[PDB]
Amino acid sequence: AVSESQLKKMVSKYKYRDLTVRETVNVITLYKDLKPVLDSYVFNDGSSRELMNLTGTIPVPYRGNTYNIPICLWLLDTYPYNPPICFVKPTSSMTIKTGKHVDANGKIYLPYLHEWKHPQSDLLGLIQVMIVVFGDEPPVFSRP
8 A cells, every 4th residue: 555656755754755766766676576665763752753664585696596685775864874774684584694794783784885975876786785795695594
């Protein structure tokens, strides 16, 4: 019950709508898998706010097979800086291989993303980085 029409109304509060709606579509439309979501956050029950996110899975060649590495997407109206946040949410069967980018908090803080600044930031690359980092050695593994 959240079509493109309703999406606009949900992302109307955002400042960079044209960039927030184009960045998401570009991905979900290219990776034909990422599903758009809308979750509002609160500051210790002191103040709420509308927030959009993207949850889905991304294939990956490993061990001679095609594994799926689930990952979530976070968005902001402008704060703290501007760039969208990244997070991972694997399944109970999967795990979180601690490393340099895949911390124990399902975070994906990458150097390429840390020092990332538009106009090269379209969200399309934000997903590609993981496709490469996870394409060499997926951390979501579960030690079969």
